[PDB]
Amino acid sequence: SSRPQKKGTAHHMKTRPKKTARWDIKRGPAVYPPLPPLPAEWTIVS
RNA sequence: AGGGUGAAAAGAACCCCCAUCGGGGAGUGAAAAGAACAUGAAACCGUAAGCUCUCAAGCAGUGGGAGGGGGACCAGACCCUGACCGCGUGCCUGUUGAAGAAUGAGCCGGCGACUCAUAGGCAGUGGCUUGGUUAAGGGAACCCACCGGAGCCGUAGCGAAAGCGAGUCUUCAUAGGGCAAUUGUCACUGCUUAUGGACCCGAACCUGGGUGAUCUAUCCAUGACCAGGAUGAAGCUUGG
RNA sequence: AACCCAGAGCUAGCUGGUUCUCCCCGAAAUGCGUUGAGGCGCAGCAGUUGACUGGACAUCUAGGGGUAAAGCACUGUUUCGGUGCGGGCCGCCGGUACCAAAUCGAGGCAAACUCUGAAUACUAGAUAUGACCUCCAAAUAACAGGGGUCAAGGUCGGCCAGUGAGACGAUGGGGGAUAAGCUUCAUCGUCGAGAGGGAAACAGCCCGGAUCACCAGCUAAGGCCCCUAAAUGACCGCUCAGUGAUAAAGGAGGUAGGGGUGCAGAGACAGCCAGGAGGUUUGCCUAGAAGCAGCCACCCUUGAAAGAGUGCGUAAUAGCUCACUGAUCGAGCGCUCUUGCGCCGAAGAUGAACGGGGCUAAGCGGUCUGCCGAAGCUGUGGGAUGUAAAAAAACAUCGGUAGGGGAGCGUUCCGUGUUAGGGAGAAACGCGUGCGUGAGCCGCGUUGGACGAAGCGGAAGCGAGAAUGUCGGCUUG
RNA sequence: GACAACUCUCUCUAAGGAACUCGGCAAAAUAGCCCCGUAACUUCGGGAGAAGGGGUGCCCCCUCGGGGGUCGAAGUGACCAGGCCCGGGCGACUGUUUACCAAAAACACAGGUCUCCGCAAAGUCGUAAGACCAUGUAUGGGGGCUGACGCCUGCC
RNA sequence: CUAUAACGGUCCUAAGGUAGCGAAAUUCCUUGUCGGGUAAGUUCCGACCCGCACGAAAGGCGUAACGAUCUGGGCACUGUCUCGGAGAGAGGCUCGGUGAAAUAGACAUGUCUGUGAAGAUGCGGACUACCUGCACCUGGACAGAAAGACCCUAUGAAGCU
RNA sequence: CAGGUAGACAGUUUCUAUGGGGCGUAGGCCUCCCAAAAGGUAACGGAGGCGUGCAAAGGUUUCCUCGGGCCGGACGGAGAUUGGCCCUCGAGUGCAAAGGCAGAAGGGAGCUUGACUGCAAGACCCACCCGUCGAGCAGGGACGAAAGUCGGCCUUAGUGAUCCGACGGUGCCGAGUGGAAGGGCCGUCGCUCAACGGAUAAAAGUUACUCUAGGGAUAACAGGCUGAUCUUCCCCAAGAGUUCACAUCGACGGGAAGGUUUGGCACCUCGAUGUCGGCUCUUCGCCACCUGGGGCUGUAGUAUGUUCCAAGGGUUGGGCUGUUCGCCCAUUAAAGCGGUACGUGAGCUGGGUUCAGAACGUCGUGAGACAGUUCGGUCCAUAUCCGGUGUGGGCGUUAGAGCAUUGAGAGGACCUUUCCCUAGUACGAGAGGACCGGGAAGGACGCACCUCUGGUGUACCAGUUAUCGUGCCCACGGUAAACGCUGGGUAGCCAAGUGCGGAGCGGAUAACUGCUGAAAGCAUCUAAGUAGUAAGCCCACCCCAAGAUGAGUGCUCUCCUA
RNA sequence: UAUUCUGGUGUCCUAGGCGUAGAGGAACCACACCAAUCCAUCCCGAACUUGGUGGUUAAACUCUACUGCGGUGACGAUACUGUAGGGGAGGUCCUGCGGAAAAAUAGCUCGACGCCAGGAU
Ligand SMILES: [Mg+2]
Ligand SMILES: [Mg+2]
Ligand SMILES: [Mg+2]
Ligand SMILES: [Mg+2]
Ligand SMILES: [Mg+2]
Ligand SMILES: [Mg+2]
Ligand SMILES: [Mg+2]
Ligand SMILES: [Mg+2]
Ligand SMILES: [Mg+2]
Ligand SMILES: [Mg+2]
Ligand SMILES: [Mg+2]
Ligand SMILES: [Mg+2]
Ligand SMILES: [Mg+2]
Ligand SMILES: [Mg+2]
Ligand SMILES: [Mg+2]
Ligand SMILES: [Mg+2]
Ligand SMILES: [Mg+2]
Ligand SMILES: [Mg+2]
Ligand SMILES: [Mg+2]
Ligand SMILES: [Mg+2]
Ligand SMILES: [Mg+2]
Ligand SMILES: [Mg+2]
Ligand SMILES: [Mg+2]
Ligand SMILES: [Mg+2]
Ligand SMILES: [Mg+2]
Ligand SMILES: [Mg+2]
Ligand SMILES: [Mg+2]
Ligand SMILES: [Mg+2]
Ligand SMILES: [Mg+2]
Ligand SMILES: [Mg+2]
Ligand SMILES: [Mg+2]
Ligand SMILES: [Mg+2]
Ligand SMILES: [Mg+2]
Ligand SMILES: [Mg+2]
Ligand SMILES: [Mg+2]
Ligand SMILES: [Mg+2]
Ligand SMILES: [Mg+2]
Ligand SMILES: [Mg+2]
Ligand SMILES: [Mg+2]
Ligand SMILES: [Mg+2]
Ligand SMILES: [Mg+2]
Ligand SMILES: [Mg+2]
Ligand SMILES: [Mg+2]
Ligand SMILES: [Mg+2]
Ligand SMILES: [Mg+2]
Ligand SMILES: [Mg+2]
Ligand SMILES: [Mg+2]
Ligand SMILES: [Mg+2]
Ligand SMILES: [Mg+2]
Ligand SMILES: [Mg+2]
Ligand SMILES: [Mg+2]
Ligand SMILES: [Mg+2]
Ligand SMILES: [Mg+2]
Ligand SMILES: [Mg+2]
Ligand SMILES: [Mg+2]
Ligand SMILES: [Mg+2]
Ligand SMILES: [Mg+2]
Ligand SMILES: [Mg+2]
Ligand SMILES: [Mg+2]
Ligand SMILES: [Mg+2]
Ligand SMILES: [Mg+2]
Ligand SMILES: [Mg+2]
Ligand SMILES: [Mg+2]
Ligand SMILES: [Mg+2]
Ligand SMILES: [Mg+2]
Ligand SMILES: [Mg+2]
Ligand SMILES: [Mg+2]
Ligand SMILES: [Mg+2]
Ligand SMILES: [Mg+2]
Ligand SMILES: [Mg+2]
Ligand SMILES: [Mg+2]
Ligand SMILES: [Mg+2]
Ligand SMILES: [Mg+2]
Ligand SMILES: [Mg+2]
Ligand SMILES: [Mg+2]
Ligand SMILES: [Mg+2]
Ligand SMILES: [Mg+2]
Ligand SMILES: [Mg+2]
Ligand SMILES: [Mg+2]
Ligand SMILES: [Mg+2]
Ligand SMILES: [Mg+2]
Ligand SMILES: [Mg+2]
Ligand SMILES: [Mg+2]
Ligand SMILES: [Mg+2]
Ligand SMILES: [Mg+2]
Ligand SMILES: [Mg+2]
Ligand SMILES: [Mg+2]
Ligand SMILES: [Mg+2]
Ligand SMILES: [Mg+2]
Ligand SMILES: [Mg+2]
Ligand SMILES: [Mg+2]
Ligand SMILES: [Mg+2]
Ligand SMILES: [Mg+2]
Ligand SMILES: [Mg+2]
Ligand SMILES: [Mg+2]
Ligand SMILES: [Mg+2]
Ligand SMILES: [Mg+2]
Ligand SMILES: [Mg+2]
Ligand SMILES: [Mg+2]
Ligand SMILES: [Mg+2]
Ligand SMILES: [Mg+2]
Ligand SMILES: [Mg+2]
Ligand SMILES: [Mg+2]
Ligand SMILES: [Mg+2]
Ligand SMILES: [Mg+2]
Ligand SMILES: [Mg+2]
Ligand SMILES: [Mg+2]
Ligand SMILES: [Mg+2]
Ligand SMILES: [Mg+2]
Ligand SMILES: [Mg+2]
Ligand SMILES: [Mg+2]
Ligand SMILES: [Mg+2]
Ligand SMILES: [Mg+2]
Ligand SMILES: [Mg+2]
Ligand SMILES: [Mg+2]
Ligand SMILES: [Mg+2]
Ligand SMILES: [Mg+2]
Ligand SMILES: [Mg+2]
Ligand SMILES: [Mg+2]
Ligand SMILES: [Mg+2]
Ligand SMILES: [Mg+2]
Ligand SMILES: [Mg+2]
Ligand SMILES: [Mg+2]
Ligand SMILES: [Mg+2]
Ligand SMILES: [Mg+2]
Ligand SMILES: [Mg+2]
Ligand SMILES: [Mg+2]
Ligand SMILES: [Mg+2]
Ligand SMILES: [Mg+2]
Ligand SMILES: [Mg+2]
Ligand SMILES: [Mg+2]
Ligand SMILES: [Mg+2]
Ligand SMILES: [Mg+2]
Ligand SMILES: [Mg+2]
Ligand SMILES: [Mg+2]
Ligand SMILES: [Mg+2]
Ligand SMILES: [Mg+2]
Ligand SMILES: [Mg+2]
Ligand SMILES: [Mg+2]
Ligand SMILES: [Mg+2]
Ligand SMILES: [Mg+2]
Ligand SMILES: [Mg+2]
Ligand SMILES: [Mg+2]
Ligand SMILES: [Mg+2]
Ligand SMILES: [Mg+2]
Ligand SMILES: [Mg+2]
Ligand SMILES: [Mg+2]
Ligand SMILES: [Mg+2]
Ligand SMILES: [Mg+2]
Ligand SMILES: [Mg+2]
Ligand SMILES: [Mg+2]
Ligand SMILES: [Mg+2]
Ligand SMILES: [Mg+2]
Ligand SMILES: [Mg+2]
Ligand SMILES: [Mg+2]
Ligand SMILES: [Mg+2]
Ligand SMILES: [Mg+2]
Ligand SMILES: [Mg+2]
Ligand SMILES: [Mg+2]
Ligand SMILES: [Mg+2]
Ligand SMILES: [Mg+2]
Ligand SMILES: [Mg+2]
Ligand SMILES: [Mg+2]
Ligand SMILES: [Mg+2]
Ligand SMILES: [Mg+2]
């Protein structure tokens, strides 16, 4: 055998998970319409 | 190495277990503090009561908490236990890097290491700045009032030096260049530096002075010892 | 080179150890010199303190250069070609198809070659508000400006540290075997000194830099059959090898596609029927060579077609069969590439060993949308440090080893003090639904039996888990 | 007490007989006494207990060893008590030695040879005084190398 | 005749190894080659000489006797062995009495494989495993008994030349 | 007092990196490359130089152009001197290399001494110490008509801090004062201080007699990484093989795997994590030595050759070695190769770490030394845990028991050689001589066993020696360790003795051989579907076995009294 | 003031150079010829020097023209690369955003600009 193996960090570089697919990279958080302005949390009644 | 019964031996009569020791009562005493006696932590050894483990894999915990128990007054809380699920590669040292199969610690409690003196530098605080300060020494014993200006720091530099001096050395030349044309000090506290063992513990050694020949190495004096058996040199006498 | 004592706490650039808490900042493993290499001096890069400053992050322009690429103008190198002085062999002063400089033509190569020559990098200059609340303009919005606050780089010094064994990864290279988790340099990233998520586990790969609380929310990297959070989602293609965990040359009617080129409707491929002749037994060679041991030639004729013969066969013939042609059959078929995914090549030593179970998708490409996913970001509350000099209110900030700075707690003792308090129970010992960022404090006792706080100050034999420490006590076996 | 494995101190083991093993390590074997016999080799002393063989108890009889009988599987019946032979190296020999991992081929040795020393000697120990050498005197005393006996000991 | 070299030439030294021995306690290559002993011989004996690198008082070559010497072979003999067996004692084992030690971070202390400072009970994935004794066995725990004798360092120590 | 002179004696020194051994080599400076177009930059990376030289090779004024082709010219030739045309920087420049430089920095001529004194703004380089460039100013000059140039050299190497001394100068100091001695200052000289930032003026070895503190920051073994070397293949096919590349070989080259050889690395442990052989004891891999089944053959037969599947079993006994290796003897079916830390040292034992003694050869003056040889030479261990082989208790198994079993799972064993029928039949001209299927005897191994043959048999029985007891004879007893010594021996235990075992027209496969048969109207062992077939795999055989917590099923028994 | 021409003299530059063909003699520049007291040749009045002649555009220089050589040289695209990733056992390949050659060809090129003296218009 004239080929080596992948030890330690080398091996990590090779084997770590990646999304190659151009479509999954370009995804993102959903865009939800804004919320109507909400009331005051707690009010003091005197 | 081995300290502390009580104020006082009042150190426990008498009965019981009973060969003695040891104990349980009674009695002494504020207390038994009962002679292995004063406070009496930890390791370690147990005894009892509450919950719980015998299909289980785990640096023993932690977040969640089934079921069961306990002392409450803010009874929806606290405390003990712990069905099962999740997460969780002892500590130190030292390393590019450790859970390491890298070193170190059996466990528990004590002892155990940047100290002191004196100087130098710097910082922080004061005191004086009619410059600052005293050293040894003297002191109603110490401390301390009051002394003690000898010293020391700051007020002029340049130059090897004579020497000159707000200048001076280098120069034929100030022509240029160099260096100068100003500055507090005495304490206390801290950080560092230096000198002494100088953060602690740890060598093999080095030298000086003694002590050893009852062991062993040689010898010296004077004693003692070596069962039993073989073999048969010289020499000597016999005779060719 | 005895022993004991003394100098002696010898000396040890070496190894081990060096004890309370919280807050802020925070490295280096490089260069030079060294009887130096595991030490040290200075520099580089901490911290704290002052003095000057005006930047940094971006944007554009300008400089010089000789790397990457490229090239043959020089220096080498090199192949063949053209021409050839120059040499070898022969003759007798005669011959040739033999080796060869320079130049030409063609074609290359180069760390120590350059007529050329980038990108970045370096040096320099010039252009441009970092955010947030307010005032605001008849005034609303926005814009403009005033005002206020905050954040942000650098040189020179003072005081005073560590560091001077680095590791891998990306990239450029040298040594080595374009071997090594090897080694040695250069520009960077992470680890060192960095927790969290993804990587089955997994210093150095990817995301992200942890003030703290929350049984809230949105996301990054990465994921969505069950173990195990989210789609047993959607729509296109592919794979049949459990490929989906790894390796090459090479092999191949594997398979799904794409592109050229042959033919054909007077019938193309395969099958089946027949023919496959004459010269001639071609010449040579040979005992023989007759298509078929070997050598050379490989034409011609009759023809629908038939090679002086593709293979078998004979001692040599014969014989079988192929190339090619007519017929039959009636719609595709030939030989070429080339992608994608597979197959074989592919074989080790304790036992599935490639996360498991499993899956023809739960594998692989391509496209669409939901969700999960961290200590990142948001939400709601507390703390601290810097502005900063009381607050309060802002804004920013708060990972951290070596290491530096700030703020504290506790122990014994002294001053106040022959203190307050204490046989109406001190110290100590044991406890706490008490209060602190912690060191700890405050309170309580069916223990204990005589001392002794707080405050405001002072001093140290002042804090222990590590020293094969050390002395006692007690285990384990 | 019991009578496992295994270890150790011991006895025995069919057929074989060193095949074991680094190596016959350890075991087994031999063994006294009397009688016969006894090699190479030699420094003529040895070798030599060479090797190898026979006999052995208890009774009577004869002579002062011999004959006859008789038991036993076995008679020096236990204990005690040599295995031997053929070779080679090294060292002549008996001796000495590393207390506690080495007993030898190392050390010694008789012998050899060199050299110093005439006596108030050389040599050794003492700062010195002096002591040893030696109450000796070159057939003696120091020191160096070699190592019986045999053959020798070459060149520079 | 292949060969070898008594014999010559030259070189250099103070001079160039004579007698005797020789694969040896000396021989590297090397288990030299030959002969013997053995069914088979890296040892042994004899001889060759090509003495890496014998040699003449650091003695050379012989040698009878001697040796708890080193080394080869042979007869006798045997559990040394083929290939183990049985027995006796002292332990081991049970019961009563007395009663240690080295060791020890804490240990609730499986296997395979993978990972990892590159050989894991302790991290991952599977697999296997009721709790706990006793007798035996010694593969592991990088098992235990402190400076690693070997290698390097130290401007260490000592002895010796 | 002086000179000489003994490691007899004393104190000390003996560098760093080599390949972390000897040995010689290297250590400062300069140029080029590496060096990634600023500068800087390492390697035991690749090339070379320097430790000076010139009185002109310096200064200046002024003039000039080298080299290389081709041609002419007495000797004279390839090449000397001379003439001429073409190319234009290819020569030169004291000496390396680099960068420069053509009416020049290159060649010549004339005059010289600036190869000056006093200096110096500012820069570059920079840890420091050093190092480099320099406009400008004054003095006194050289050359030049003058402008101007000149503080050595086209540039970059040609060097050495400090202390100390030496010579020449000097308006300085001069220990009461005057002088002197001696010093200061300026100029300069003196080290291969070359280990070149120089430790002193002055310095080598050795330790296996050794020791201390440390680290393996650095090796020796093993582990890991790597795989050059090694081992096993595959690709191409020049040929060989009567014809014929591919029965069998396969040159020139290529592509791999493995991790067993010799290595590289230094990640690993240094304290007591240690190499090669045997003994005992396993176990696993397959690249298959034999045994089972096949394909091809240049296979007639027997026997081969090569290759495919196959690791269930097997793989002897000796002479020789420290050995891995290897050689032989006699067998054998065959006497396989590897891994497991030499697999195995808290299981055993030899060497090896050649420890201290000694001797030989050799090196060294020497102490001593040797990957030379030789003789001698101490490794301990009561098992805590895991792991194992056995053997119990507890508890579970849903009321408690006693028996009998099913069998998930686990193991043991299924091995092999001759000979004889078949048949001297096929096969072959003969010589030779089968496949297939039957039968016996053996081997090894396993399971038992004691009838026989034995071994032991300290239960016993007999002889017998010495001796002391029982009063003495007789006869017995003790002792001669754990039989005094011998001769026998039953039961037990045991083997060399005796038996027995290895069975399967069961199941499913590997290779291979096949039948029907498409995709490609042909063919094809395969795509559908099936048939044969292996010492292999699984059931059957033999023991264990419901803690098989999934704790099974069956039969029976017992649950009183108040 | 212009313009044209000759000679001198510079600066800028794309470095204007060689070749072929043509033009210039009144002026200007040059050679040609002749003689050597200043000076001159390592030999030579060749060069350099002083003083004459009056010949010629032959050489030289000058001016116009021309791509044959020479010099210069794109646009595009490609190689390379900065940064953000991806593939491969590796040697090395690929993508996005930004920069961007060398070579080769297409073209360009027979310089530009200024002062002085001297003629001519
Ligand atoms: Mg490999
Ligand atoms: Mg991984
Ligand atoms: Mg995403
Ligand atoms: Mg009483
Ligand atoms: Mg009594
Ligand atoms: Mg009493
Ligand atoms: Mg009472
Ligand atoms: Mg009372
Ligand atoms: Mg008490
Ligand atoms: Mg279970
Ligand atoms: Mg458990
Ligand atoms: Mg470590
Ligand atoms: Mg370490
Ligand atoms: Mg301790
Ligand atoms: Mg320990
Ligand atoms: Mg203390
Ligand atoms: Mg200190
Ligand atoms: Mg002090
Ligand atoms: Mg005495
Ligand atoms: Mg005495
Ligand atoms: Mg005595
Ligand atoms: Mg006497
Ligand atoms: Mg006596
Ligand atoms: Mg006697
Ligand atoms: Mg001593
Ligand atoms: Mg001390
Ligand atoms: Mg002292
Ligand atoms: Mg010292
Ligand atoms: Mg910070
Ligand atoms: Mg050091
Ligand atoms: Mg700083
Ligand atoms: Mg440029
Ligand atoms: Mg260039
Ligand atoms: Mg290039
Ligand atoms: Mg190129
Ligand atoms: Mg060229
Ligand atoms: Mg060309
Ligand atoms: Mg280059
Ligand atoms: Mg150019
Ligand atoms: Mg250009
Ligand atoms: Mg840029
Ligand atoms: Mg350094
Ligand atoms: Mg280093
Ligand atoms: Mg790296
Ligand atoms: Mg490069
Ligand atoms: Mg290569
Ligand atoms: Mg560190
Ligand atoms: Mg970081
Ligand atoms: Mg990051
Ligand atoms: Mg943040
Ligand atoms: Mg933060
Ligand atoms: Mg979401
Ligand atoms: Mg789910
Ligand atoms: Mg789906
Ligand atoms: Mg797979
Ligand atoms: Mg035929
Ligand atoms: Mg899976
Ligand atoms: Mg969160
Ligand atoms: Mg947090
Ligand atoms: Mg938080
Ligand atoms: Mg945050
Ligand atoms: Mg605050
Ligand atoms: Mg604040
Ligand atoms: Mg404040
Ligand atoms: Mg912090
Ligand atoms: Mg710190
Ligand atoms: Mg107190
Ligand atoms: Mg007190
Ligand atoms: Mg308190
Ligand atoms: Mg009282
Ligand atoms: Mg103290
Ligand atoms: Mg105990
Ligand atoms: Mg017994
Ligand atoms: Mg006996
Ligand atoms: Mg026997
Ligand atoms: Mg016999
Ligand atoms: Mg013996
Ligand atoms: Mg015996
Ligand atoms: Mg006899
Ligand atoms: Mg004899
Ligand atoms: Mg011998
Ligand atoms: Mg002797
Ligand atoms: Mg001894
Ligand atoms: Mg002896
Ligand atoms: Mg001796
Ligand atoms: Mg005398
Ligand atoms: Mg001797
Ligand atoms: Mg021999
Ligand atoms: Mg040998
Ligand atoms: Mg032998
Ligand atoms: Mg020799
Ligand atoms: Mg001699
Ligand atoms: Mg003899
Ligand atoms: Mg003796
Ligand atoms: Mg037995
Ligand atoms: Mg006993
Ligand atoms: Mg357990
Ligand atoms: Mg690994
Ligand atoms: Mg493992
Ligand atoms: Mg765990
Ligand atoms: Mg064990
Ligand atoms: Mg044992
Ligand atoms: Mg462990
Ligand atoms: Mg040193
Ligand atoms: Mg020293
Ligand atoms: Mg000495
Ligand atoms: Mg650069
Ligand atoms: Mg550079
Ligand atoms: Mg270098
Ligand atoms: Mg000159
Ligand atoms: Mg001037
Ligand atoms: Mg010159
Ligand atoms: Mg000096
Ligand atoms: Mg005087
Ligand atoms: Mg005077
Ligand atoms: Mg005086
Ligand atoms: Mg005087
Ligand atoms: Mg001067
Ligand atoms: Mg030095
Ligand atoms: Mg130096
Ligand atoms: Mg010196
Ligand atoms: Mg020795
Ligand atoms: Mg010593
Ligand atoms: Mg290991
Ligand atoms: Mg082939
Ligand atoms: Mg290391
Ligand atoms: Mg150990
Ligand atoms: Mg196979
Ligand atoms: Mg045949
Ligand atoms: Mg097999
Ligand atoms: Mg097997
Ligand atoms: Mg086998
Ligand atoms: Mg057979
Ligand atoms: Mg072995
Ligand atoms: Mg072991
Ligand atoms: Mg010698
Ligand atoms: Mg011995
Ligand atoms: Mg146990
Ligand atoms: Mg039950
Ligand atoms: Mg049964
Ligand atoms: Mg079954
Ligand atoms: Mg089971
Ligand atoms: Mg069977
Ligand atoms: Mg027949
Ligand atoms: Mg048969
Ligand atoms: Mg029997
Ligand atoms: Mg019987
Ligand atoms: Mg018997
Ligand atoms: Mg009697
Ligand atoms: Mg008796
Ligand atoms: Mg089948
Ligand atoms: Mg077939
Ligand atoms: Mg068909
Ligand atoms: Mg099928
Ligand atoms: Mg079968
Ligand atoms: Mg049951
Ligand atoms: Mg159940
Ligand atoms: Mg141009
Ligand atoms: Mg132009
Ligand atoms: Mg003309
Ligand atoms: Mg042109
Ligand atoms: Mg372009
Ligand atoms: Mg990239
Ligand atoms: Mg350009
Ligand atoms: Mg171009």
Residues with CB under 5 A from ligand 1 (ion): A 1
| Resolution, Å (one decimal) | 3.2
Give the structural domain span for A40: 1-46
Give the integer Cα–Cα distance in Å for A36 and A13.
47
CA of A34 to C1' of G81 (A): 46
DSSP string for A1-46 = -------THHHHHHHS-----HHHHT-----PPPPPPP--S-----
Is residue A12's beta carbon less than 7 angstroms from any atom in nucleic acid strand E?
no
Give the CA count within 13 Å in the CB-facing half-sphere of A14: 7
| Cβ-contact A11, A4 below 8 angstroms | no
How many domains, chain A? 1
Which experimental method was this entry solved with? cryo-EM
Structure tokens at A3: 């080929």
A25 Cβ contact list (under 8 Å, min separation 6): A19
